[PDB]
C-alpha cells in the first residue's frame, strides 16, 4: 500500500541494488545486465550472461545460492519470486561482458597493446560499427599515462550517443597502483532486431 510516486522509486531502488549485487557474484559467469518484472505478489527476473552452463552445473546449485540471497535480502516469499536465465547471443557487442575479458588479461600481465587489440578485433569481427578502449593509470613509470586504442568510428555527442553507444567503466587493483578500464562500443541498427531506427545524420534516397 504505497503512493504512485513511491512504487516507481522503490522499484528503481530495488533494481540498482540488485544490479550492483550481481556484479560481485557473477564475475566468472560473465554478467550482462538484467530486467525486473514487478507485481504486487509476484516478481520475475531475467538474469543475462554468457556462460549459461556454469549455472546449470551441479544440477543448478549456483542459481539457488543467488536466489536465496535475493529472497533473504528483501524478505520476499518463495513461489512469489521467479528467476530465469537467458543467454547472450553475440557476446562481442555487449560492453559489461567485454570489459571482463580485458580485466581477465591485465591481471595476468599481458601488454596493454595486446590486451586491447584482442578485444577491439573481437568486437568488430562479431558485428559492430566501432569501438574504443582506454587503459588509464600506472604502467612502467612513476607518472600515470593514458592509453587510448580506437577503430571504426565512434559517435560522442547529442541524443544519438545514448541509443547507439554501449559503454562500461571499471578498475583493476594491483600490487603497484589502481588502473582504470573503459570500453565504448558502437552498434549498427538492425531492421527490427535486438536499435531499430537509423541515425538522424544519415538519409537514404530510393533508386529510380
Amino acid at each position: 500500500r504505497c503512493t504512485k510516486v513511491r512504487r516507481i522509486i522503490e522499484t528503481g531502488l530495488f533494481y540498482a541494488e540488485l544490479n550492483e549485487l550481481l556484479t560481485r557474484e557473477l564475475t566468472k559467469e560473465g554478467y550482462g545486465g538484467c530486467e525486473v518484472r514487478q507485481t504486487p505478489t509476484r516478481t520475475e527476473i531475467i538474469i543475462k550472461a554468457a556462460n549459461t552452463k556454469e549455472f546449470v552445473d551441479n544440477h543448478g546449485r549456483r542459481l539457488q545460492e543467488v536466489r536465496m540471497m535475493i529472497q533473504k535480502r528483501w524478505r520476499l516469499k518463495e513461489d512469489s519470486l521467479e528467476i530465469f536465465i537467458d543467454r547472450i547471443q553475440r557476446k562481442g557487442l555487449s560492453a559489461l561482458n567485454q570489459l571482463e575479458s580485458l580485466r581477465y588479461k591485465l591481471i595476468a600481465r599481458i601488454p596493454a597493446r595486446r590486451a586491447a587489440y584482442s578485444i577491439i578485433r573481437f568486437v568488430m569481427d562479431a558485428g559492430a560499427r566501432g569501438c574504443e578502449v582506454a587503459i588509464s593509470g600506472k604502467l612502467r613509470g612513476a607518472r600515470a599515462s593514458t592509453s587510448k586504442y580506437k577503430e571504426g568510428y565512434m559517435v560522442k555527442s547529442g541524443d544519438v550517443t545514448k541509443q547507439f553507444v554501449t559503454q562500461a567503466v571499471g578498475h583493476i587493483p594491483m600490487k603497484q597502483a589502481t588502473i582504470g578500464i573503459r570500453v565504448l562500443i558502437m552498434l549498427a541498427q538492425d531492421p527490427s532486431g535486438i536499435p531499430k531506427e537509423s541515425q538522424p545524420d544519415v538519409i537514404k534516397v530510393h533508386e529510380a
Binding site: 541494488e17 550492483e20 549485487l21 543448478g60 539457488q64 545460492e65 536465496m68 533473504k72 535480502r73 524478505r75
Partner: protein, 90 residues
C-alpha cells in the same frame, strides 16, 4: 567475541537452514529473521571465512555469507545431524 549461548545456536541454525544469511554492514543494527544486534552474525561470519567455511560478498552496505562445501560438513558435526541434511535442492 562473547556471544550469549542461545542466540549463538539460532544464528548457526539460520546459517545452516538457509545457507545465505544477510546482515547490515552497519554494526549495532537490529537484525531481521533472527532478532539481535547486527554485530553478532557479522563478526562470526569473518571467523568462518578465515577457517574457510563461507564466502563473503558485499554490496550496498549489505554483507552476504554464502556457505561453502566444508561448512556443510562442519555443521553436521556441530548440530549432530545425519547427512543430507540446505537450499541446494535442484
Amino acid at each position: 567475541m562473547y556471544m550469549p549461548t542461545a542466540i549463538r545456536r539460532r544464528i548457526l541454525r539460520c546459517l545452516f537452514e538457509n545457507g545465505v544469511l544477510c546482515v547490515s554492514d552497519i554494526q549495532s543494527g537490529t537484525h531481521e529473521e533472527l532478532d539481535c544486534l547486527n554485530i553478532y552474525p557479522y563478526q562470526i561470519g569473518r571467523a568462518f571465512v578465515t577457517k574457510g567455511f563461507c564466502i563473503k560478498t558485499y554490496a550496498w552496505s549489505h554483507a552476504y555469507y554464502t556457505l561453502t562445501d566444508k561448512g556443510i560438513e562442519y555443521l553436521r558435526n556441530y548440530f549432530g545431524l545425519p547427512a543430507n541434511a540446505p537450499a541446494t535442492l535442484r
